[PDB]
Design a protein around this nucleic acid. Structure first.
Length: 1137
RNA sequence: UGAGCCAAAAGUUCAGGUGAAUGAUGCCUGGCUCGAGACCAUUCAAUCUCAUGUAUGAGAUGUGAUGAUGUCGGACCAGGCUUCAUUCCCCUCAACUUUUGCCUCAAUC
């Protein structure tokens, strides 16, 4: 419309309020405004930040569906009703980059406004709706006030307005002037208001409904005597109040009384029937005996009334009037939800007309349940013709899709002036007709006439800017401007609102986030004591109750006269407290038991060298000792060059700083090696290598080319060889020149003997080698010796460590890579080191902060013990540079060094290495076997996170320190014993030893739970069930007792360990394998292993083993999800096998 | 050519931790709207005393209306905490299956 275009142009120039009924395309104008700001160039693309603010979740979905068709710029929407304040802030940051437009509820925006950016999120332009509904008490107005005053450079000069405002905020009839309250609102809005111009362009395509006066009800109530019975029902409700869920049942009796007076007893019978269905559901909902007795009492009273009401059993004429032509589009409204619920039942009994109703989303007394999504489904169903023909009644009159509705009749609903205008707007083009019924029973006439006249006169007068201010000057200011001045203008008001909102959010989040012992804990409570003073003002003092976890949070404030204001002042002080909480080469000869001598410039160190080193050879065990018998020995350069040439022929050629065998260096042998029909000679072949290279023990005259060669395999049917020479001719296409030539004995330089004996190689065919066979055997072992020498050099580097208590031979074992299994594995040392590191980190955290939350302390422990952080320390160490793929466990090597150091030296020395790189009660004492010097530490362990309205201390801090110390103490005992278990199996055994369930078993054995005091009844029931089971809370209390013992013992590991050692001593001796039966069945046969699916979300009724060959067996347990039932079936399978 | 074994990889079945998502919720809080109240603001109408030394002022008292606050019930609505069920993620773990790496065997080099 032309008027709508004028408001759109004005809205771009400055913030403007547009007056319309039922939108009438105002939403389209708002979409055009969003497109208009998007099209123009902006300094920052996201600076415009057009946003639509609507509190209702269904309205957000309806706005989103229209937004998708247009709004080409990316859009984001919030479902709402989710308790994730941190997630919402993270989503907002991600949304700001990803989407230009955001849609949010007003209350969620208030959460974003708390701790807002200096530019207040750079919103610049936002869309505001329901301003008329909003009042100074209402939260939406408080959200508007923060926008109304802009801290930086007029951050939000123009605000889009979707607030049509049907008449005024409220009380149009009370004000003689058209809108004194609206004038106060406009100053708070800081927005120009456009003239309504109702007939200038509007109503050209919009119909106007006409009010019709009708009788209040069809016919009249026929039960005057039953009204006296209704008074008796009220007396019965008063008796229920005297007797002292019961209140809700009393409300049901009140609802029956209201319905029977308004629509007669026949309607009341229908409400009683609906209450009877509600009674059955509420009886299932609440099992309390007192509530059930009240429900049964109510059911008997209504049932006695129902029989007479059934013998006895709205606006039927109106339904008949619109019945003609089968009109589908109609809307009806009712005073109460119960009347709407029973309206189809009333229609079915006598009119025989199908009817449906829309229940309010919020449910009172749980008579009927409406989901927000279900309400959206109901409006979508209403669009379908069949549902529209039935027609729907909603008291709320909100989020309903109704179009072309000839009848907009409203029943007993003159309470809201804006809603009356909204219903007039709702009625559409066909047969437009507003229906209002005067009531014969009560005087409903004068009030309605006055309200209608006042509303029309006020709209006409307001069709001019500042009409009220022009008409009255001082008087208008005194009546309204003085009564309702703009708020948040001063700095203090903004500070206080931000503080109250922040207080509520912070207290809820922190309390729920820490212990989490119970689903609901009343950690925060308020108690009020009257402080009324003589003076006609009355005052209240609000006590605040907080848990032992928050020591200074408790505060009492009686300064504010109002009880609510006094509570707000206490909350403001608590919020500030929450903010504070937030805040020339030596010759070396190796002797093996001719010896090989290695020339090394560095003198050998006796401590690094090992007197005895084992040789991994099956034939014999050899011990090798290396020492430098000369220092800085000088060898001639010509001799050195010959040695190098001899060494490469001796080693590099055979393999395909300088090592020379010494008998006195064998110079003559070195020279020969540097240089490197026939009849076999025994002296020549006594020691030589033959290359077609193999050692020759001797030449066998009996073996000859003439002698026949046997065929080892007949499976392939190879031709049998008449002569050994015939085999050579087949194998190599060669014939030996001499038939009687002796044949070299078969030997293998490579790592069996019978295969070498089977094949004999001719001396003429294979050339002899000067090098002796025994020297070649030493040369074969020489590369392994060289690898050992490299490890010894690495050991010299280990001695270079700044502090080492003894020669670090154990560190050399740690250096070798895990899983190579060449000699030794450091995994066992790594486990001890990891436990030591965890205990030290926990002790440091307790020192850094004594009162720090246990959950925060656990997070601090995790980051300190993280493998990646240790890996970074290893990178500075240069451990990777002893081909590293970056997935190598350098951190595990660091843990192994800590474990090796703990065995090598005292804990203080190990801590220094960590600095270098890593940086009734008497009866309880008898059962504990530990006497407590301080009673308070024992009391702290006895105190639990769950408390019966009294909190002394937090056991969480003790449990965290206790758990870490216990893990280290248990590992030390296992490590001290030489179990020699496989390292992976040892890790599983260590994990089994540190089990919360085993600690829980210890707690029941010592009756620790009985000594412990907790406020959770259900937790005690779980403890008693565990006692029945044995013939993690209990484990945590044992850790808390251990932490208290540690504080009592001055943090001495040995004293705490002596107390804890006896209980787990029986458990360690049995294997206690954690492999499990089902996993053992998989080890036996996983080739065809099938596992039965659990039946339903709840525990499956039976668990069966589907694995083949073992067969199908049934196991019974509390749940098959843990697979304990499957484990029992696997044990049955083992019995079957 | 097989068979075992020994390491790895890719899968698969686990004991577990680890987060996320979607449901089922549960709990709590704020306000809206209307009636009753009670007490404060103002004061007609009527009354009531004092003056001027007829006409009128001190003016009061107060019927009534409005404007606030504090209660008690109706009709509404939006958030915040929050848990289990399922799925998935990641990290170990008990393995298993195949290939490789790589010991054997002996034709066999």
């Amino acid at each position: 419309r032309r008027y709508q275009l004028d408001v759109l142009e004005q809205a771009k120039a400055k913030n403007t309020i547009a007056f319309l009924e039922t939108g009438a395309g105002k939403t389209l104008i708002a979409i055009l405004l969003i497109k208009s700001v998007h099209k123009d160039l902006m300094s920052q693309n996201r600076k415009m930040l057009s946003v639509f603010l609507v509190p209702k979740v269904p309205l957000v979905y309806q706005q989103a569906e229209v937004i998708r068709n247009q709004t080409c710029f990316q859009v984001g929407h919030y479902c709402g009703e989710m308790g994730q304040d941190f997630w919402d802030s993270r989503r907002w940051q991600r949304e700001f980059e990803s989407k230009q437009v955001l849609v949010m509820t007003a209350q969620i925006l208030l959460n974003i406004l708390r701790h807002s950016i200096i530019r207040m999120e750079t919103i610049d332009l936002l869309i505001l709706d329901e301003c008329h509904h909003a009042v100074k008490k209402h939260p939406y107005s408080l959200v508007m006030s923060e926008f109304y005053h802009t801290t930086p450079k007029d951050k939000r000069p123009a605000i889009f307005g979707m607030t049509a405002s049907p008449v005024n905020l409220k009380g149009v009839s009370s004000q003689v002037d058209c809108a004194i309250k609206i004038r106060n609102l406009e100053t708070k809005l800081d927005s120009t208001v456009c003239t309504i111009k109702d007939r200038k362009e509007l109503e050209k395509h919009v119909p106007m409904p006409s009010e019709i006066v009708v009788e209040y009800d069809k016919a009249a109530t026929m039960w005057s005597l039953h009204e006296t019975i209704k008074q008796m029902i009220a007396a019965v409700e008063e008796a229920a109040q005297a007797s002292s869920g019961a209140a809700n049942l009393i409300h049901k009796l009140r609802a029956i009384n209201y319905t029977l007076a308004e629509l007669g007893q026949w309607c009341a019978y229908k409400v009683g029937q609906s209450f009877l269905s509600a009674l059955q559901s509420d009886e299932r909902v609440n099992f309390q005996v007192d509530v059930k007795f009240q429900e049964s009492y109510l059911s008997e009273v209504v049932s006695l009334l129902q029989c007479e009401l059934l013998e006895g059993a709205s606006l039927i004429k109106l339904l008949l009037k619109y019945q003609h032509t089968a009109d589908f589009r109609a809307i009806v409204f009712v005073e109460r939800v119960v009347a709407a619920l029973v309206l189809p039942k009333v229609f079915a009994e006598l009119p025989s007309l199908s009817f449906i109703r829309c229940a309010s989303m919020i449910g009172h007394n749980n008579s009927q349940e409406m989901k927000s999504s279900q309400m959206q489904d109901t409006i979508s169903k209403f669009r379908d013709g069949h549902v529209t023909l039935l027609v729907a009644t909603s008291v709320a009159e909100e989020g309903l899709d109704i179009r072309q509705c000839n009848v907009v009749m409203r029943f007993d609903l003159a309470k809201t002036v804006l809603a009356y205008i909204q219903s007039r707007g709702r009625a559409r083009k066909p047969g437009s007709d507003y229906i209002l019924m005067v009531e014969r029973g009560n005087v409903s006439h004068a009030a309605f006439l006055r309200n209608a006249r006042n509303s029309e006169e006020t709209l006409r007068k307001e069709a001019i800017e500042r009409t009220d201010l022009s008409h009255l000057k001082d008087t208008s200011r005194l009546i309204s401007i003085d009564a309702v001045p703009g708020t948040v203008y001063k700095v203090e008001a903004t500070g206080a609102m931000v503080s109250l909102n922040s207080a509520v959010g912070l207290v809820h989040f922190y309390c729920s986030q820490l212990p989490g012992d119970r689903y609901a804990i009343l950690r925060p409570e308020f108690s009020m004591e009257k402080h009324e003073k003589p003076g006609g003002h009355t005052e209240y003092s609000c006590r605040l109750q907080l848990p032992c976890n928050a020591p200074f949070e408790i505060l009492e404030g009686p300064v504010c006269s109002s009880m609510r204001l006094a509570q707000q002042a206490v909350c403001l002080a608590a919020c500030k407290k929450l903010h504070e909480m937030g805040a020339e080469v030596c010759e070396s000869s190796k002797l093996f038991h001719s010896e090989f001598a290695i020339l090394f410039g560095n003198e050998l160190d006796a401590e690094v060298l090992s007197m005895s080193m084992d040789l991994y050879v099956a034939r014999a065990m050899i011990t090798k000792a290396s020492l430098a018998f000369k220092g800085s020995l000088d060898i001639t350069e010509n001799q050195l060059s010959s040695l190098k040439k001899f060494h490469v022929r001796l080693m590099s050629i055979v393999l395909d700083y300088l090592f020379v065998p010494v008998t006195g260096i064998n110079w003559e042998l070195v020279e020969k090696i540097t240089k490197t029909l026939m009849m076999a000679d025994g002296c020549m072949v006594a020691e030589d290598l033959i290359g077609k290279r193999f050692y020759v023990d001797s030449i066998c005259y009996d073996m000859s080319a003439e002698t026949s060669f046997p065929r080892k395999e007949g499976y392939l049917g190879p031709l049998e060889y008449n002569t050994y020479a015939d085999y050579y001719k087949q194998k190599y296409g060669v014939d030996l020149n001499c038939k009687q030539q002796p044949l070299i004995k078969g030997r293998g330089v490579s790592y069996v003997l019978d295969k070498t004996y089977y094949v004999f190689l001719p001396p003429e065919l294979c050339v002899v080698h000067p090098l002796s066979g025994s020297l070649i055997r030493g040369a074969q072992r020489l590369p392994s010796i060289m690898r050992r020498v490299e490890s010894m050099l690495l050991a010299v580097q280990l001695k270079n460590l700044i502090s080492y208590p003894i020669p670090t031979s154990k560190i050399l074992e740690a250096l070798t890579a895990a899983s190579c299994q060449e000699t030794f594995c450091y995994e066992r040392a790594e486990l001890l080191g990891d436990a030591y590191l965890k205990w030290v980190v926990s002790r440091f955290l307790f020192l850094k902060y004594p009162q720090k939350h246990e959950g925060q302390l656990t997070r601090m422990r995790q980051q300190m013990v993280s493998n990646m952080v240790l890996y970074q320390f290893a990178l500075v160490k240069g451990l990777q540079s002893y081909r590293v793929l970056s997935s190598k466990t350098l951190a595990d090597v660091v843990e192994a060094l800590i474990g090796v150091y703990y065995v090598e030296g005292g804990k203080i020395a190990a801590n220094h290495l960590m600095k270098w790189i890593g940086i009734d009660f008497v009866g309880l004492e008898r059962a504990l076997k530990y006497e407590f010097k301080e009673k308070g530490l024992l009391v702290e362990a006895i105190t639990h996170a769950s408390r019966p309205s009294s909190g002394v201390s937090c056991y969480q801090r003790l449990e965290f320190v206790g758990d870490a110390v216990l893990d280290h103490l248990i590992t030390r005992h296992l490590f001290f014993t030489y179990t020699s278990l496989p390292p992976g199996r040892l890790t599983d055994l260590r994990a089994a030893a540190v089990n919360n369930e085993n600690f829980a078993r210890v707690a029941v054995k010592h009756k620790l739970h009985l000594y412990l005091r907790h406020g959770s009844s259900a937790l005690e029931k779980q403890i008693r069930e565990f006692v029945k089971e044995v013939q993690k809370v209990l484990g945590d209390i044992v850790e808390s007792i251990a932490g208290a013992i540690f504080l009592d013992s001055g943090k001495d590991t040995t004293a705490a360990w002596k107390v804890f050692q006896p209980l787990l001593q029986p458990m360690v001796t049995p294997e206690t394998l954690p492999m499990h039966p089902v996993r053992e069945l998989q080890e036996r046969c996983q080739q065809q292993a099938e596992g039965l699916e659990y039946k339903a979300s709840r525990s499956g009724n039976t668990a069966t083993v589907e694995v083949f060959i073992d067969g199908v067996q049934v196991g019974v347990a509390q749940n098959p999800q843990k697979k304990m039932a499957q484990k029992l079936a696997a044990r049955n399978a083992l019995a079957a096998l």
